[PDB]
Amino acid sequence: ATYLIGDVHGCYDELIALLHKVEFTPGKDTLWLTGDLVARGPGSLDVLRYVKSLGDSVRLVLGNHDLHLLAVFAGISRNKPKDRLTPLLEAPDADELLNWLRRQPLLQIDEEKKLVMAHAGITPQWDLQTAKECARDVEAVLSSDSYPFFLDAMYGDMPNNWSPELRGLGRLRFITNAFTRMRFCFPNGQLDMYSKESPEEAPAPLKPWFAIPGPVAEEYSIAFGHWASLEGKGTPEGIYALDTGCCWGGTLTCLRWEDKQYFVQPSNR
Ligand SMILES: [Mn+2]
Ligand SMILES: [Mn+2]
């Protein structure tokens, strides 16, 4: 079976309880995770140890909090106490865990399922070939010995409009924001990097990225996490918003792909 779970955010106990509910069995089943494995919840260390141990039985994409953790580890960014990352950062296997994390994808594609997953979704300004090329480019910098330089460059809100002519810092920053920070778009597809509200509460003319027809979403289903104020609802057919805010006192959501059946684990906090 194929299971897709939204943002875990250190909620190890809820993750394991949900996997036990569906009797997740590596070797018979595969788990897809939308990223943001870490921060806010108490168990980021246990989450990373477990997910790394799954190997080929898990298909992860990196989220914005996973990248922030890497930046803290590399000394690029300051540790925020509310993220509760210190047990992971101080663990004796922190190097092993975080060198594994930075080699994971930003984009997962399964052609037989016609299924795409990224942390924030797929901007409507991208076709599939462009999304693949951009994912490959940023995965290459994150997996290289020089990844702290890119982590430092990644911060920023501009440019917010895609062009194949984009180069350099702006190109990488756009790619990172599209895959890991996107929520709202302007009508032409341009990213808005400020509004984090639910679609009903957003100022006009902002609309969800998935409300703008794009070439990937016309051919593939898209699963994503990230947008907790969406509460996993309000999406079109073929769009699966899996982040139901477990670390915020909401729920952890698991979707089984074969029958589109949902399973929910209440937050323990
Ligand atoms: Mn998140
Ligand atoms: Mn996120």
From Swiss-Prot:
Cellular component GO terms, alphabetical: cytoplasm
Name of the top EC class for this enzyme: hydrolase
Catalytic function, reaction form: P(1),P(4)-bis(5'-adenosyl) tetraphosphate + H2O = 2 ADP + 2 H(+)
Any one of the GO BP annotations: response to X-ray
Source organism, top-level taxon: Bacteria
One Pfam family of this chain: Metallophos
Summary of activators and inhibitors of this protein: Co(2+) is a strong stimulator (100-fold increase in rate of hydrolysis). Mn(2+), Cd(2+), Ni(2+), Mg(2+) and Ca(2+) are weak stimulators; the two latter act synergistically with Co(2+).
Coiled-coil stretches: none
Keywords carried by this UniProt record: Hydrolase
EC number(s) given by UniProt: 3.6.1.41
GO MF assignments: bis(5'-nucleosyl)-tetraphosphatase (symmetrical) activity; bis(5'-nucleosyl)-tetraphosphatase activity; hydrolase activity; phosphatase activity
Homology family: Belongs to the Ap4A hydrolase family.
PANTHER family, sorted: CYTOCHROME C5, PTHR40942
HAMAP family on file: ApaH
Functional description taken from the UniProt entry: Hydrolyzes diadenosine 5',5'''-P1,P4-tetraphosphate to yield ADP.
Subunit note: Monomer.
NCBIfam families: apaH, PRK00166.1
Name assigned to this protein: Bis(5'-nucleosyl)-tetraphosphatase [symmetrical]
Organism: Escherichia coli (strain K12)
Recorded name of the encoding gene: apaH
